[PDB]
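Reminder to self: tokens first, then the designed residues, so the page reads top to bottom the way the pipeline ran.
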């Protein structure tokens, strides 16, 4: 949903650290 595009910014990097 549109909630992923938002959590992405925090879910994309957090995935690394």
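Designed residues (17 positions):
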């Amino acid at each position: 949903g549109e909630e992923e595009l938002q959590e992405n910014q925090e879910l994309i990097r957090e995935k690394s650290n």
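Helices lie at 2-14.
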